[PDB]
Amino acid sequence: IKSALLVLEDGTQFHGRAIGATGSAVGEVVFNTSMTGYQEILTDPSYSRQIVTLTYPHIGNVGTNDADEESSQVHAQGLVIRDLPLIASNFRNTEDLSSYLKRHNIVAIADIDTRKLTRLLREKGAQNGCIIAGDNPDAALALEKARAFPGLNGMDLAKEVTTAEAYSWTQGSWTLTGGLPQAKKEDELPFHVVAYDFGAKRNILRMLVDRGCRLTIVPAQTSAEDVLKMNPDGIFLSNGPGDPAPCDYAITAIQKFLETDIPVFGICLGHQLLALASGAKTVKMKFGHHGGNHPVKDVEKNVVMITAQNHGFAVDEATLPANLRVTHKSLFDGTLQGIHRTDKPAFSFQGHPEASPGPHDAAPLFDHFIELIEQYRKTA
Amino acid sequence: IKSALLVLEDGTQFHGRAIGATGSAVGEVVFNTSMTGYQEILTDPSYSRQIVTLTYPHIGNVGTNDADEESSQVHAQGLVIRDLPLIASNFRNTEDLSSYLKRHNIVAIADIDTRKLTRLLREKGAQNGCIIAGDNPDAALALEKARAFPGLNGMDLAKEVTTAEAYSWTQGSWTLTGGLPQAKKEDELPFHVVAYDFGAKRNILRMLVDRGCRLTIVPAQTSAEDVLKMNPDGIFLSNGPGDPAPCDYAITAIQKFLETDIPVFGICLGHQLLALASGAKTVKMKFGHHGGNHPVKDVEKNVVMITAQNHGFAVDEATLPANLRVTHKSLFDGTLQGIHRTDKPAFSFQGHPEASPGPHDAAPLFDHFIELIEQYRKT
Amino acid sequence: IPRFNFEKFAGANDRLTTQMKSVGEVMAIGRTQQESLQKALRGLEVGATGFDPKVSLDDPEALTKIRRELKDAGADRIWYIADAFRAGLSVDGVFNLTNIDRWFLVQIEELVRLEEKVAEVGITGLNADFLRQLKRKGFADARLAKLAGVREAEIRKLRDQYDLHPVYKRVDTCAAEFATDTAYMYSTYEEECEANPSTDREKIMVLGGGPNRIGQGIEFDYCCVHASLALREDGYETIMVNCNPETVSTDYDTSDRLYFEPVTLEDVLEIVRIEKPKGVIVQYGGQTPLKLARALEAAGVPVIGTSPDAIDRAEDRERFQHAVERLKLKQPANATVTAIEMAVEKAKEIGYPLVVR
Amino acid sequence: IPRFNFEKFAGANDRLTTQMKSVGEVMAIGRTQQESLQKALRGLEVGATGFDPKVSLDDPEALTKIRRELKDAGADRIWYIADAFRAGLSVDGVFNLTNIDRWFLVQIEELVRLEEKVAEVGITGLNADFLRQLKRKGFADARLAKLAGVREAEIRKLRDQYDLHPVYKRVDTCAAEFATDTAYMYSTYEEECEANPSTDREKIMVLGGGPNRIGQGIEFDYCCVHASLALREDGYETIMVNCNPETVSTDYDTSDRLYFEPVTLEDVLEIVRIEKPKGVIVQYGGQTPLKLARALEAAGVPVIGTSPDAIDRAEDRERFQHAVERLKLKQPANATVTAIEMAVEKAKEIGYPLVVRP
Ligand SMILES: NC(=O)CC[C@H](N)C(=O)O
Ligand SMILES: NC(=O)CC[C@H](N)C(=O)O
Ligand SMILES: [Cl-]
Ligand SMILES: [Cl-]
Ligand SMILES: [Cl-]
Ligand SMILES: [Cl-]
Ligand SMILES: [K+]
Ligand SMILES: [K+]
Ligand SMILES: [K+]
């Protein structure tokens, strides 16, 4: 008997068992439908301050491994599951899930009616909650903590996870045969790109490098003046947690780039800022998009792609400026997923083209950027 | 590989495997010959600031259980052993040894030649050492850490482990059938003993209660007058870590009680303090007595008792004041183990009457205290 | 879980290979692998209530037989896996023989251990915290009952005591991200119930035949489907109970409510409990539901059409002879003989050739 | 470990019960249970080198035989336990059948897995670290050799390449709390050596016979004790090697230095390596030492007394025949027959009644 408890703002109780660190966890509770990629899910910075619920009952079946880490740490505040398997069984495993959880100090709860919870959040929308893992968790206390939580609306979390200093990135993508490759020599990669670190995922970088791009990761608050001084062949805006609204420096820096002919490409939060910096407005979804079976139409080509999604905010297309075209849309709810600049060489995707985890369906989006960039150096 | 390293002041290195928390531990290295009682030993406050080496190769065969905890915590700075068995195998086990050490954040090492360690400590005397359990343990640093340790000599550890406030203790001894008993109601217990917490073992307390003694546990520095105010039937001087010599507040309080007719019995540290109070001198032993097979003779009755011992300092007999009579002596080395004030109701024993772990042979010692107490009240 | 019919093919090689030999299949849905796997075994219609022992704990030769069964798989290997755990084989040993991933194997082993506990404590040891545990792992009342030394009904009666009844969740293709208007459900021991039974319509339940097997084919399903279609057309709310994934009976458009469940006394009673139907048809699904007739009625279910008693009079040899005789009709000469010697005699009587059942 | 002799009592019930059926016992000392136990197995004098297999893995019927031996213990249960682990049974399975505390069982399972590793990696895979860890768990060079498909000598040699040799610790009644002036030692794979062999004396080693068995009793031990008593009295430094806990030969008073160890070639060589005796007596302890004689001298050991070749000349059927003829002495008519038919004829020729040796 190793108790755990989940209490939401509405004071909904979920009694189960502890499977991770001992203590307390607080954040916005979300549900994710991905049947695969839970480690990647947990190491995604975008999960900052939110307590992740996995709809797929068996979580941890393949254990864990390093190559499957999206960031340096476990960004989720918590983890709620239906069932932790007795064992991990996969040749890639290096450590079971409970173990890993403890190692990262993650409070985690299992054996709870994750469906009922999913249905609540669906119908009722995003709730704040708290997990209390311990000997005699106090309901009333967790509830109190649940309610005390400020909430993600209006919360700049990107500054909370960005890098302190700028680093170079030259590492390609993993392979079954070779695992994670050795970073390249800058003498190897042809294009140079700046990447604002709003809480970036390794996969983006890797996929970028795969394309022949030498990256320069900068902190979230870097000035445009400063960036422009690097003579970028392109500028990349990363994914990240919290509200994108509150990130004044970004919009600024972005607006500043737009003034220019350099190609901008944003993903998830990067997409939101690009919108914000273009005149657009952002909104906070009732429940958001968390899963890897999300259908997104390319209005232009009338094509459909299965995508990986992780957002609790979106851009209003009603708020779109005539200089910002609509390129992608969600077939699940009609929500906006891509926009391009009529005037500029800037584009952005709400979904995760780098996936990890999920369908490789949206990958060609990086192809546009490179195009832009090749073009820039032709003319430039 | 989970690496661990043990380095002694002299630069001797012992390469092993980590079995407890990741990190560093520093202290005085001692060896203990007890073939059973490892958990009790670990939780004995007297081991504060010491790295405990166990000579019996297989440590952890029966796992751990809360009833076998001699205090609230694991007081040993580290544990050095030869082999950590694959499993715990005993109906009383609630948690494997390695798990428990981690829980308690004890840096611990296994798989080393503890016999070689023992022979060195025996031959050259106690040494300070450092255990570094981690990825790539730095031997130069462990040697530096080992050498920077100030040593137990001149170190009052009693004040370090004592209780902050005074509490009441009315729980007795465990039983196989019963287990640990519920604590008693003061009325059930005829005597009030004020026991100075110099880092006292749960077992002594229990044994007193068993003997019908309600107890009031007082902090180490409590004043004689503050105690007297409790109208004690008897006063008890607990066992405890470090040098007794520097515990002036103790000596002091004691000498005061020694102006009175109040019965006083100390154990271990308590024993050394009672002697210092009486004017005798203490010494730091070459390696000390740590084990559960130590033969002690009752010089009076000329009988031998097998005892549990845990002390690294001793009372010098040649500095005995004529008011202190030698009651016990060690059959291994001739060292002093017991004393009785010729003029007062004050006696003490060097070994451990409450055992835990070890032979129950010295238990009869408590009877003589209780007998003095009865006397006292009789009158 | 596939359905086999090897006993009907005595001279056949009964070892599983690349050429299919199964005649049908069963499907189950559970919130967890163990629950799903156990519901399937009990829906299989082979007389199993879960992991019923195949070999005796005291047979000295048992490990030998188990080993053979695991190494060169037959239709009953699933049962032997369990027996192998009860007999002392480790997960590694079972894997080496079977090549079945340990992720699955360890789950079966834990089910065995829990069975061991039940056997130990018995009924008196069936607290509610533990009965729930057992239910949540997919344990059948009939299985526990065997283990505990009692009757299935005792187990069920017990479950009521503790208000230990399953809840029903719905299939939605989306993991609850989107609501559903469809009533395609599966039982589970969870918190929220999504069954939300109607109270305004007259309901009629149709019991399917579980997996197909020789003699219990699609002809039965066709009738169940027809029962549902006609009654629905007529305005009754139709509830289908079945677990054969190959048929039209388990297609969600065939009925108003589909419960994709094992066709057992247990599972059916839990549905009736909440649905409270006007009638239950047990005559269109073959042997499976026919056999449940009498106990469903005993249990208070509103069984329509020919009565369980009427069915028994047909189904029971003597009863029916009695009926023929009453009707003064003609049947071939028969006799019931226990022993050989008696047979040879009754036989001289009856007259060859004969039909020996 | 007890020593049995059921083969000599072909019709007896061989199941162990409350009435003793053993004829002797061996004892071993190790720094850990595993080492202790493997060393006892190797000095039991039953041809074992540790947990040698009793049953093949390829036998469909193996588990049935296995289960039986576990459930109704005979003299071979110790080997059947490992056989069990090798065939997939678990610790709880074995416990259930045997009632032996799991504390011991898990150690045996761990040793089987390590064996499987040797089998897989082969000799090439036997690096210093691995080999040392194996030596520490008590594995014999011979057992390791069978596992990696090589000769014992190769494993031993490898150990030399790696300077992997045991150390000797002393028995002292006090876990080293007090010094000892007695040389009562056991081998272990540890860091410090307490052997401290003298270099001012002429040493004579006497090898004992292990545990007693029918035909190898106290009579040899007596001879053993006498060699030590006599030679020490003469001024020699006497060293006894033996592991029977019942005899006078294993009383520390009997010799100058007692090595309580398995009387095996490996164990004896290790002692010889550090003692450098002037001479080794192999003729007084019975069959045990007699059989190591040839390999000992062939290993550089100073075997004294009747040579291993002369011994063989005597023990050898045909070599001896020759001797007897050369000496022109009388010997019963004999014939070595491979097959039956030949038997009957050769037999016609030798003259009944006959004595048929197996
Ligand atoms: N269970 C039901 O009655 C369905 C209710 C609702 N349509 C939902 O999907 O939440
Ligand atoms: N091993 C020996 O040579 C014994 C030396 C010494 N007497 C000791 O006990 O340390
Ligand atoms: Cl819940
Ligand atoms: Cl060492
Ligand atoms: Cl229970
Ligand atoms: Cl290795
Ligand atoms: K629960
Ligand atoms: K070592
Ligand atoms: K030496």
PDB file of N, CA, C and O in Angstrom, chain A residues 68-83:
ATOM      1  N   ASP A  68      15.288   8.415 -26.519  1.00  0.00           N
ATOM      2  CA  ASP A  68      13.885   8.730 -26.478  1.00  0.00           C
ATOM      3  C   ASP A  68      13.534   9.898 -25.603  1.00  0.00           C
ATOM      4  O   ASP A  68      12.356  10.090 -25.299  1.00  0.00           O
ATOM      5  N   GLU A  69      14.577  10.648 -25.218  1.00  0.00           N
ATOM      6  CA  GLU A  69      14.385  11.833 -24.425  1.00  0.00           C
ATOM      7  C   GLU A  69      14.424  12.990 -25.394  1.00  0.00           C
ATOM      8  O   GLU A  69      15.313  13.077 -26.232  1.00  0.00           O
ATOM      9  N   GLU A  70      13.393  13.827 -25.282  1.00  0.00           N
ATOM     10  CA  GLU A  70      13.231  14.988 -26.155  1.00  0.00           C
ATOM     11  C   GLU A  70      14.000  16.254 -25.724  1.00  0.00           C
ATOM     12  O   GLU A  70      14.388  17.100 -26.528  1.00  0.00           O
ATOM     13  N   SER A  71      14.234  16.328 -24.417  1.00  0.00           N
ATOM     14  CA  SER A  71      14.964  17.361 -23.714  1.00  0.00           C
ATOM     15  C   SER A  71      15.912  16.753 -22.679  1.00  0.00           C
ATOM     16  O   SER A  71      16.120  15.557 -22.558  1.00  0.00           O
ATOM     17  N   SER A  72      16.516  17.598 -21.878  1.00  0.00           N
ATOM     18  CA  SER A  72      17.440  17.148 -20.859  1.00  0.00           C
ATOM     19  C   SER A  72      16.730  16.580 -19.656  1.00  0.00           C
ATOM     20  O   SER A  72      17.278  15.740 -18.945  1.00  0.00           O
ATOM     21  N   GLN A  73      15.505  17.058 -19.451  1.00  0.00           N
ATOM     22  CA  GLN A  73      14.735  16.616 -18.325  1.00  0.00           C
ATOM     23  C   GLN A  73      13.273  16.280 -18.629  1.00  0.00           C
ATOM     24  O   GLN A  73      12.745  16.442 -19.721  1.00  0.00           O
ATOM     25  N   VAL A  74      12.622  15.800 -17.588  1.00  0.00           N
ATOM     26  CA  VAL A  74      11.240  15.435 -17.598  1.00  0.00           C
ATOM     27  C   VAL A  74      10.551  16.743 -17.276  1.00  0.00           C
ATOM     28  O   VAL A  74      10.644  17.228 -16.153  1.00  0.00           O
ATOM     29  N   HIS A  75       9.908  17.322 -18.284  1.00  0.00           N
ATOM     30  CA  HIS A  75       9.217  18.566 -18.080  1.00  0.00           C
ATOM     31  C   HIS A  75       7.848  18.388 -17.468  1.00  0.00           C
ATOM     32  O   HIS A  75       7.362  19.291 -16.808  1.00  0.00           O
ATOM     33  N   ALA A  76       7.201  17.229 -17.618  1.00  0.00           N
ATOM     34  CA  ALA A  76       5.900  17.095 -16.970  1.00  0.00           C
ATOM     35  C   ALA A  76       5.980  17.266 -15.453  1.00  0.00           C
ATOM     36  O   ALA A  76       6.915  16.874 -14.788  1.00  0.00           O
ATOM     37  N   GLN A  77       4.958  17.863 -14.883  1.00  0.00           N
ATOM     38  CA  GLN A  77       4.856  18.112 -13.465  1.00  0.00           C
ATOM     39  C   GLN A  77       4.360  16.873 -12.778  1.00  0.00           C
ATOM     40  O   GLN A  77       4.577  16.631 -11.594  1.00  0.00           O
ATOM     41  N   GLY A  78       3.624  16.111 -13.568  1.00  0.00           N
ATOM     42  CA  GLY A  78       3.019  14.901 -13.081  1.00  0.00           C
ATOM     43  C   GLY A  78       2.676  13.926 -14.188  1.00  0.00           C
ATOM     44  O   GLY A  78       2.866  14.203 -15.373  1.00  0.00           O
ATOM     45  N   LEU A  79       2.217  12.778 -13.728  1.00  0.00           N
ATOM     46  CA  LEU A  79       1.845  11.679 -14.587  1.00  0.00           C
ATOM     47  C   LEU A  79       0.775  10.831 -13.957  1.00  0.00           C
ATOM     48  O   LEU A  79       0.900  10.307 -12.843  1.00  0.00           O
ATOM     49  N   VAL A  80      -0.304  10.730 -14.714  1.00  0.00           N
ATOM     50  CA  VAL A  80      -1.469   9.947 -14.310  1.00  0.00           C
ATOM     51  C   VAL A  80      -1.704   8.825 -15.338  1.00  0.00           C
ATOM     52  O   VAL A  80      -1.797   9.076 -16.545  1.00  0.00           O
ATOM     53  N   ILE A  81      -1.794   7.576 -14.884  1.00  0.00           N
ATOM     54  CA  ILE A  81      -1.992   6.443 -15.786  1.00  0.00           C
ATOM     55  C   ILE A  81      -2.962   5.431 -15.258  1.00  0.00           C
ATOM     56  O   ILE A  81      -3.340   5.482 -14.095  1.00  0.00           O
ATOM     57  N   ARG A  82      -3.371   4.509 -16.139  1.00  0.00           N
ATOM     58  CA  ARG A  82      -4.300   3.496 -15.686  1.00  0.00           C
ATOM     59  C   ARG A  82      -3.524   2.310 -15.140  1.00  0.00           C
ATOM     60  O   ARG A  82      -3.866   1.763 -14.085  1.00  0.00           O
ATOM     61  N   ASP A  83      -2.486   1.933 -15.896  1.00  0.00           N
ATOM     62  CA  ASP A  83      -1.664   0.810 -15.516  1.00  0.00           C
ATOM     63  C   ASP A  83      -0.195   0.850 -15.863  1.00  0.00           C
ATOM     64  O   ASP A  83       0.236   1.050 -16.985  1.00  0.00           O
TER      65      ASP A  83
END
